[PDB]
Each structure stands twice: as structure tokens, then as C-alpha cells.
Write a protein that binds this ligand. Structure first.
Ligand SMILES: O=c1[nH]c(=O)c2[nH+]cn([C@@H]3O[C@H](COP(=O)(O)O)[C@@H](O)[C@H]3O)c2[nH]1
Ligand SMILES: O=c1[nH]c(=O)c2[nH+]cn([C@@H]3O[C@H](COP(=O)(O)O)[C@@H](O)[C@H]3O)c2[nH]1
Lengths: 643, 658
């Protein structure tokens, strides 16, 4: 009703995105959708696409609605009207055709391989040509248009113009499907669902949660929205306070629960009884404890608020909510805590089973949430923040009592010494060099020759466990460190960072260590747990790196940047027998679309060397810091986080 | 040592590998080197030409990586792409505009050597960075996009720059451009073919191996087979010892047709019939495991199979009295590693010999002594097949889809008990509402409100249409299957869907994506062929890795694959697991008939890399009628209740069901 239906035979998502970017509402339907169903719903126009015969209602062409056939859609269109078939380019277009007004006679388009029109359907006219291949057809009086190319991609340079001609000129869509209007529709639906009931929101301090809170407050009375922040003791420096301050500025008050002590001393049942969080080393155990503790506290706090419990809603900032979550997913990463089953969480269980859990942001994409936040009056600084994980800094401290050394340790280090000193090592061949040779490509070997002669590198295992993905599985295994005598050549390090995990599948990460060469890598660890002093050190480190990044103008160039503390104290004379007391900081830059794959930022490339070095300079000053390191690993085998 | 060869200096990490691929497709040898490689090294190595690339970044950046400007002056032809052109212009005293990336139609100077054979107008991928103001002296502008300089040339020193990427397909005639540079300009002859690479590879095998024997463990897969043929072609008949251990989990007569094809080419294969050894195989738990033919757990299946294989392999080397000190082991692996991950062994494809096993001393020694070689390491997947043909292997043999080490063992869902957790009834109620959405919406209750609250407006709309046009049932099946959610593997429910009417495939595929988004306790969604399933089973047919169960699946797998092959669409799918499930449908619940029949799943899969992928949609990548023939045919096999079609993509699914 003012909208446009997309029927795909395979592109639907892409057309959906382009139509949305042009401020028209776009629902995708299955190809078999009948025309009466489309007429009943009041769609203004129909878009039909598909790759290089499935059941469709030919009435989609006959019911008097404008139709755009892209590719297969164009073929269907032609076939339905009698036409036949036989058997990136600069094509010719007839800019008098409604679809093509305001284009040049010549257009760059993405043409896909497959069938091509022979007899052009009666009442239709050819309106685009690529050599002889018919690239466009049109019946103006029936407002049916076929294009062989895909205007919905960016590789078709003026595809946005074509789509505009279809939606506005031909179909008469007015361009009112904006974030502003969707926000107002969203407010109306919130008013309608909630009525006079109170709404509790569990505000974590992240972007989605804050916009959700601001949206709920905008939709409802001031007295109807209760924002509750449970501080788990693992949040960054000053960023709890500034979220409260921003929401306060908008007339929204936030109830803060200072629950740090209950998280630090958190303990739970394991799939047996866990250690307290402040004595745990296991990342899986950290997540369960924190997950289980948060929910117990949330459930209690809801209890304490003396609300009529059949007039309470619980609202979340989740963009992709689920009915049932898996505990497997809770154990390993991001997950909806309130959607999994727990003990001592009756109130939450009741809200869930009563249909009182709402996700107002479910109809918005991630970029839209930001625009939504600006519109609701939140500062741009706040809405542009990088994601920050629920368990916060807890998964950013590598905790250990003992060094991580398995029986493969000595061999792997021998392999690594060869890799780092490859050009020299080739001049004194031994058994293990031959194994390296037998497992690496001629091209890789040759590139290794150059790299290791142009620079003096050391490579070695660090006695710590980090998470990584090997095939379908998460795995905990070694970090490999590289240091150099002179300034680092970044691209060469990136290369080693890919090469080493390929050679040694027991290596999950390759990092670069800043400063002088590491002649004697530690074989011991600084004892490290989630204690208030350790968290204090990391908070200051994380703060400095993030401020430096932000002040530099480059914060938007990276998706995320975990800053990690490791139990490693470097540069002790081994014949001095001095104990391991200091810790070391990793900078883990990450660039990604979807967080399934991604790359570090290469300094000199997406981020300036100077910015990175300034981080190193500043963090070194923090008391208790041995070395700074830079994570060079891609995902896979890396992951964004270190645990 | 590199005459006839070209060197690629990549300032970044992106374009080096693409240029390398393109150059190799042009039959020229290509080496990727660091940007900072000195001119004299390039000179002494013998390279015929240099290609330099990198991205939009400024060469005037305080960051700009170091390079040896004498690379431009050693007298070898140079093609600079984007960053490379920017470097080139800077070196020879040009400048960039003070002020400040799609696909444009640009103009090109026909007479410049780089552009011979092209029309003046050309479509290219133009990058977005710095643009040439003062063109370096001795250079002429040879390509233009509006006012922007897009190409430069110095013909006398054979130096060419382009502001676009001819190495990408989206530069329509980028191949012609690279051809002009490698052939017309640099004078490469195009000797770097699979044929000549094979001859070089043979020379290298003779050299490393001498008169020593080479053992190869022939798995039956393409890589293993090509490797075996390769080694035979390089050495004597007496030198190559090919051993095929039959693990009992192979497909119908494909460890015969691989022995036969190799014998016909003069290659003898010692076959070890070890099926029974695997069936009753056992291993330590990561305590003794159960026997393979009594195991339900896929981790145990893999470890048992993996451990047994290496133990027998070691046993065979022993009985031949082959000393590791005078013998080699060869693997068909494309991407070998020195050290294998112990996790990967237990969960999927891995090099079994590059991990420590107990009681495998001869294999350990072969690895430790550097006697494991990988002939195929310098070839890509597409080249392996070409190589196999050139070695005289049959097209049907080099063309086979991958088939996992543990074979059919991970394609039988083994069970004694139904898989049922506390979430079972709740999940079934959710699925009932999903399947019956438009009718459920007409009579709304609390659970419906939970469904609307977790679904997008769009998905609800799409779901309204679907569930009014067809009458569908949806329900959990009481079995476990592997799935990947985010970073992690999971073992959880399969959801089933049946319909009164003919299946609408795109609707089912939508449902297949929706249901796992709503219910993260669900790893897969299948379509069950035939009449509606009114009363889903809550019991399972007890099922283990036993000879009769294997006989049945082997037959189902055979039929499915034959139909696929004889219809011509075999090459359109990447892999087709056929899976046996412990499920007996259509028993009248008010009668207490025991579960004794089983059901077959067709799992079509399409992928580039096996990290993500999709099922084939019947009527899309594969004809409906071909799928329906598998259904008709497989149903005839004794003991088979229903046929199912896997609708799940990866993620949340995986290729295999275990
Ligand atoms: O809320 C969260 N709870 C968690 O336990 C968790 N673990 C990882 N992450 C975030 O998810 C994204 C992917 O992280 P990985 O690449 O390490 O899997 C990145 O954005 C990570 O920060 C989490 N978020
Ligand atoms: O040699 C193997 N041993 C195994 O244990 C194994 N498990 C999966 N596969 C194959 O690997 C690819 C990925 O499948 P998944 O999506 O199930 O991980 C698919 O091609 C699978 O056939 C295996 N191969």
C-alpha cells in the first residue's frame, strides 16, 4: 500500500536494499505468489528478478500494475506475451523509454550469461541493445519493462537512476519510506502494544540498548520506561557515566546497580560447581558465570520493583531476536541471555512466556539504528561507538597460573626459528628445513627468502592460550610472537601472519611485539586473574588506545579494536632468575562486514603507523607493562576477541 | 634462476595474489616479492618484467612504504597499477593534484603498446585516490577519464602505468592489457603451462627421491589418485608402492574402479581389505571407546577411524620391511602442514600423519626424518584435474566430488534412544504456529504474540502468504545433527516439514532460513516427501554402523548419485551427502508398531570454499524432476520409510550431518 513487491527466482535482498535506499517500502515474496494476493495488499508495482520452469501466476503481468523484469523476470515477461528465445559491457539504451529517461545513449551495465530474446513479444519494443543481444524491452501502455542487466548492483553505474525511474516516474511512489516515518510508525505500534503498562529495559550501555531506551521513552510517558543498568565491573573507563549522562540530558533517568562484587565473586553450576570468576582461567567458564549472574540479578531487580507483573514489559535492543537461544552459543559468544533457560529466573521466564518481551528495533538494520539515535537526540559520538561484548573486559584478560606448554612446544619453536631466519637457514640445510620446504609453496618459499634477508626477525611461541577457529570449530592454542631488530615492515609481517598458521595448525595467532628483539622469550607467566588491580590496568590501557584512535580521526576505519592484557613479562635475564611480575598489552584491530571473516588493520594502510606507535608509546608508561603487541591475524584463524 | 618470469611487487596484500592468478592464466611464471625488494636483486634473479600494485593510498603519505626507486631504471619493462602508477609518476618527477571508485567507460590511446588491439572507449574499474597533475617527464598520457589521467607511458624505457585494475574481470579487456604487457612488451613466451609445470615437477621428484621407494596411501579421492599417477610417471614401476586401505565406509564399487583405472595405466595398487578392522575398531577417549559399530557419537567415529587408519598404515609399512631411512611417503594434499591441529582431526578434514598417534613409530620416523613429500603442493584445485587428464586418468575419475575420509560412517545417524530435551514440546508448539501462521493469526493466543515479537514485519508478511497457499506441518525430529552457529559446532534438532500439496521450493527454502533464526536449538530444516506427516514419530529405529545398515545407505547413495550423473547436473553441485536416519514414519499411533524402518536424506550442496554454502533449490540449480526420480527410486529399497531433502544453508547447517 504505497509499497512495491519483489519476486525473486534465486538478488531479492539486493533489490530490497536499493529500493529501501530510495525511500520506498519493499517486501519480498515467493515467486508463486498469486496476483490477487498482490492486488489485495495494494502494492503499487512489482519487481521480478532471477539468475541465468518455476510456477508463477502470469496475472502478475496482467492486473494493471507497473512491472519491472530484471533478467529472468524479463524472460518471463517476454515469454508470457508470446516472445521466444534462440541459441560488464557498454550498451546502447533508448533514453526515450520511461525506464531510461535521463540516461546517455551509452551505459555501463552488468550483463549475465544465459538466454536472450529472439521474437520480441507483441506490443513490446526493444529499448536496449548489447551488440545484437536484446538488452531491454518495453510496453509503455501496459507499463511493463524488461532489462537483461541488473540495475540493482553498483557495477551498473546508473542503476540507481533506472530504479528511480521505475519507482517514482512510472509507479508513482512518493519516497516517504524513510527512517523518520518508520520511527513514527514504530512509535505507534509501541503505543498500541504496551498501552498503559510499564516497560523495563536492560540497558547495557551499548548502542542498540541506548537507542531502544530512547525510542521507548519517546513512544511512551516518562513514568512508563524504567531503564536499568547492571554494571558487571568489566565496563570500560567513563563510558557507563557518559551513557547515563546522555540519557539524562533527554529526560530519561537510569537506575544503576553496582553489581561488580557479585560478578567478581560470581559462581555457577557447570554443564559440577565453578570456581569464583576472579579465580577462573577458562573463557567458557567466564561466559557462563557472567551470563548466569546477570540473569539472577536481573530477575531479582525486577522482583524488587513492586510492579503489577501482568502490566510489565521487558524491552531489548536486539536486532535479530530469537524465541529460543542455545546455551552452546551463550558459552562461546554473543547470545540473548533472557531467551535461554535458567535457574532462579522465574519473573523473566513469565515475561517471556506471557509475550511481554519486545524488540522495537527488530525492523531496523544496524546503520538505521544509528540514524534512529541521531533523530531521537543522542550524540553522534555515542551512536557511532564500536560494539563492546556483554562480558566486557573479562574476555580480554588472558588468565593463567601456569605457562601453556604442550609436548609440541619445542618442535614448533624449532620450525619457527627456521621460518624467521629462512634465507640464512637455507645455506645450512638440516632435516627440519627440508620439512619446511616440503610443506610450503615455491612462491611462498621465494617470498620468504626475500623477507627474511631484508629483515632480521625472531619468531617463537608464547606460553599462552588464545581462541581461534579451525574449520567449523573453536580451538584454544598458542600465540606466536614476532620481533625485529629494525623498524617493522608491515606487509611482510602480515604475510608471515598468514603463512605460519598455514604451516602450524597448532598456532591460532601471530602477533608483532614492539621494541628491541626478544632474544629469550619467557617460558613462564605472570599469575593473572580477574582481580580489581588487573582490571584497573587494562581499563587504563584500553582507554588510551581508544582515545588515541578516536582523536586521530581513524576510529571509523576499523570495525572493532579489542585491547587485551596477557600474563607475559619480557626481557628478564634468564640467568638472573627474577620472577614474572609484569604484563603485556595486545592491540587487536579488526576490519569486517559481518564478523564471520575479517582482517587486522595493516599500519601504513587502513591506519597510520604514527597512530599505532603513539598507542605503544602511551601504554608502555602504564605501571606494570612489559611489552605492547599488535595482532596480525585474520579471521580465520584469528577471531575478533582473544577468548 | 627466473628467466621467462615476472615479478610482482605488491604494496598491499590484496592485488598481488590476483595479478599472480591472472599472469598464471596467461601461461607466464609469476613471483610475488616485497615492495622493498632492491633493484639489483630483481636484476640478478633474471626477471623479464615487473608489475607493481597496491591501493588508493597516497605515495606522498608520511606512511608511504619504502621501495628502491632503481626498480624503475634497471631496464626491464614495468607495469604500474594504481599505487604502482603513482609510484612511477613520482619517481620521474611528476606531481599529484592537491584535491582528493566505480566502473567507468574511459578513453584509451590505441597506439600505446599496452593498449594495442583495443577500442578507444574501454570499461575499467577506476580506483579513487590521488590523481596525476604534472605528468612525469618522458611520459605521455595514454588513457583518460574525463579530466583525470588514467594511464601513462614512456615507450622508450617500456614503462607503463594505469589508474585501473586490469587484473579484475570487471575490467572487461584487462586480460588483453596484461597480454600486451607480458607478450608484446616484455617478451614472455608463455611456457608456464600445466604441461611444463608437470615436467618440472617430475624432475624435482626424481631429484629428491633418487632410487628410494615411495609409498603413497591411496584414499581413492582425486588428489590421492593424481599424486599416485604422477609419482608413477616420474619413477619406475618398482619404486612406487600404492596402498589402498578400504575402511568399510566407501561407496558402491569405487575402490575397485579406482584400482582398475590405475591398473589399466600400468599402476599396481595393494588393496588392504580392512573393513572388519574398522567396524570393530576402538580407541582411547580424549578409557576405551565403544566399538565403531556401537558408537553414536561422531567425535568417537572420527577418532576411531582416524586412529585405526594410521595404525594399519604403520602395520603395512612394517610388513613390507621398508626402512624409513631409505623410503618416502607421498600425499596428494594440496595444502600440507608441518603440524596438524588436534581439534581438526576430531571434527573434519585434516592431515592424519601430521599429528601424534600412539604406536605408529614408522610413520612418526618418516615425518621426523623429512620423508613426507607433497607433489601437488604447487598446483591449484583446477590444475589437479588437468594434470590427471594429462597423466591419462579418465574424465569421470578426475571429475568426482570430494568424499570425506570417514566416508559413510558420518552419514548414518546412529541411535539407540530418541533425542528429546526439555525444550521439545515448546519448540513443537512454535513450529506448529509457524506452519499454520495465517490460520493461527486468525485465532491469536500468547504464543503467537511471542512469534510476532521475534519476527520482522517482512517475515510475517512473507509467512502469511506461504501458510495460506499451502497446508504445511512443521515439527522436530527426535535426532541430532551437527550445525555451526557463530564460531562454534553444535549438535541439535532437525526440523521436519511436510505438505498436503506439491512442494513450493522457494517457500520451503525461506522457511528453512526463518526457523533456525527463531529457534537456535534447531540446526537443520528438511522437506519430507510424500503425504502429510500427521503424527511425527517420538521413537527411533535403533541404528548403528552395521553391515546391513551400510548396505542400505550404500545402495541409496548409489541411486541418488547415478540419477544426478545421468541427468548432466553432477557438475552443478559441489557435493551431495546422502544420509540415513533412524526414522520410521506413517505408523498408526493407536497400534504400537515398533520403529524398524529408516529414512533417507538428500543433501545437495553448493559452495566456493566449504566455509559457507547453499542447498540446490529444486527447479533452480537442479531440475525438480531429477530430485523426484531419486525419491521414486530410493523409496523402492527395502527398509526405507521416507525421503527427505535438506533445505539448510551453511550456516547454521554444515555440509555433512555429523
Ligand atoms: O555480547 C557478546 N558476548 C560475548 O560473549 C562475545 N564474544 C564475542 N563477542 C563479539 O562478537 C563479535 C565476534 O567475536 P569473535 O570474532 O571473537 O567470535 C565481536 O564483535 C565480539 O566482540 C561477544 N559479544
Ligand atoms: O576427510 C574428511 N574427514 C572428515 O572427518 C570430514 N568431515 C567433513 N568433511 C568434508 O569437509 C567438507 C566440509 O563439511 P562440513 O560443512 O560438514 O564441515 C565437506 O566436503 C565434507 O565432506 C570431511 N573430510
Amino acid at each position: 500500500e504505497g509499497a512495491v513487491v519483489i519476486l525473486d527466482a534465486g538478488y531479492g535482498k539486493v533489490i530490497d536494499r536499493r529500493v529501501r535506499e530510495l525511500f520506498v517500502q519493499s517486501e519480498i515474496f515467493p515467486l508463486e505468489t498469486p496476483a490477487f494476493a498482490i492486488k489485495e495488499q495494494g502494492f503499487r508495482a512489482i519487481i521480478i528478478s532471477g539468475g541465468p520452469a518455476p510456477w508463477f501466476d502470469p496475472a502478475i503481468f496482467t492486473i494493471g500494475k507497473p512491472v519491472l523484469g530484471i533478467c529472468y523476470g524479463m524472460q518471463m515477461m517476454n515469454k508470457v506475451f508470446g516472445g521466444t528465445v534462440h541459441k560488464v559491457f557498454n550498451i546502447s539504451v533508448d533514453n526515450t523509454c520511461s525506464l531510461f529517461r535521463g540516461l546517455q545513449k551509452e551505459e555501463v551495465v552488468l550483463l549475465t550469461h544465459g538466454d536472450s530474446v529472439d521474437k520480441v513479444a507483441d506490443g513490446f519494443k526493444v529499448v536496449a541493445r548489447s551488440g545484437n543481444i536484446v538488452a531491454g524491452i518495453a510496453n509503455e501502455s501496459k507499463k511493463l519493462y524488461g532489462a537483461q542487466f541488473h540495475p540493482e548492483v553498483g557495477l551498473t553505474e546508473n542503476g540507481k537512476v533506472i530504479l528511480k525511474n521505475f519507482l517514482y516516474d512510472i509507479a508513482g511512489c512518493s519516497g516517504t519510506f524513510t527512517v523518520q516515518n518508520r520511527e513514527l510508525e514504530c512509535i505507534r505500534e509501541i503505543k498500541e502494544r504496551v498501552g498503559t503498562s510499564k516497560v523495563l529495559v536492560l540497558l547495557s550501555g551499548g548502542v542498540d540498548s541506548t537507542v531502544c531506551t530512547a525510542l521507548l521513552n519517546r513512544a511512551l510517558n516518562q513514568e512508563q520506561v524504567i531503564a536499568v543498568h547492571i554494571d558487571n565491573g568489566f565496563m570500560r573507563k567513563r563510558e557507563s557515566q557518559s551513557v547515563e549522562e546522555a540519557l539524562k540530558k533527554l529526560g530519561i533517568q537510569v537506575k544503576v546497580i553496582n553489581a561488580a562484587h557479585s560478578f567478581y565473586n560470581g559462581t555457577t553450576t557447570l554443564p559440577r560447581i565453578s570456581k569464583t570468576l576472579n579465580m577462573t582461567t577458562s573463557p567458557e567458564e567466564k561466559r557462563k558465570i557472567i551470563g548466569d549472574t546477570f540473569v539472577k540479578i536481573a530477575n531479582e531487580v525486577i522482583g524488587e520493583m513492586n510492579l503489577k507483573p501482568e502490566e510489565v514489559f521487558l524491552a531489548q535492543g536486539t536486532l535479530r531476536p530469537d524465541l529460543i537461544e542455545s546455551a552452546s552459543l551463550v558459552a562461546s559468544g554473543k547470545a540473548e541471555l533472557i531467551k535461554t533457560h535458567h535457574n532462579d529466573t522465574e519473573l523473566i521466564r513469565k515475561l517471556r512466556e506471557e509475550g511481554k518481551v519486545i524488540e522495537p528495533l527488530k525492523d531496523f538494520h544496524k546503520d538505521e539504528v544509528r540514524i534512529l539515535g541521531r533523530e531521537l537526540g543522542l550524540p553522534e559520538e555515542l551512536v557511532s561507538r564500536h560494539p563492546f561484548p556483554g562480558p566486557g573486559l573479562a574476555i580480554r584478560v588472558i588468565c593463567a597460573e601456569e605457562p601453556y606448554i604442550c609436548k609440541d612446544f619445542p618442535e614448533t619453536n624449532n620450525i619457527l626459528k627456521i621460518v624467521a631466519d629462512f634465507s640464512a637457514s637455507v645455506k645450512k640445510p638440516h632435516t627440519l628445513l627440508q620439512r619446511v620446504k616440503a610443506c610450503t609453496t615455491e612462491e611462498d618459499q621465494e617470498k620468504l627468502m626475500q623477507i627474511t634477508s631484508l629483515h632480521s626477525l625472531n619468531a617463537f611461541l608464547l606460553p599462552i592460550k588464545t581462541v581461534g577457529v579451525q574449520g567449523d570449530c573453536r580451538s584454544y592454542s598458542y600465540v606466536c610472537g614476532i620481533s625485529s631488530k629494525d623498524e617493522p615492515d608491515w606487509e611482510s609481517l602480515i604475510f608471515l601472519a598468514r603463512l605460519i598458521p598455514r604451516m602450524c595448525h597448532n598456532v591460532n595467532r601471530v602477533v608483532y611485539i614492539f621494541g628491541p628483539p626478544v632474544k629469550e622469550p619467557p617460558t613462564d607467566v605472570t599469575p593473572t586473574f580477574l582481580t580489581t588491580g588487573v582490571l584497573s590496568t587494562l581499563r587504563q590501557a584500553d582507554f588510551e588506545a581508544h582515545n588515541i584512535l578516536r582523536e586521530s580521526g581513524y576510529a571509523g576505519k576499523i570495525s572493532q579494536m579489542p585491547v587485551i592484557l596477557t600474563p607475559l613479562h619480557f626481557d628478564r635475564d634468564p640467568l638472573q632468575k627474577q620472577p614474572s611480575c609484569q604484563r603485556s598489552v595486545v592491540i587487536r584491530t579488526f576490519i569486517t562486514s559481518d564478523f564471520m571473516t575479517g582482517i587486522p588493520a595493516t599500519p601504513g594502510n587502513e591506519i597510520p603507523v604514527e597512530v599505532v606507535l603513539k598507542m605503544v608509546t602511551e601504554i608502555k608508561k602504564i605501571p606494570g607493562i612489559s611489552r605492547i603487541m599488535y595482532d596480525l591475524t585474520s579471521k580465520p584463524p584469528g577471531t575478533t576477541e582473544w577468548e
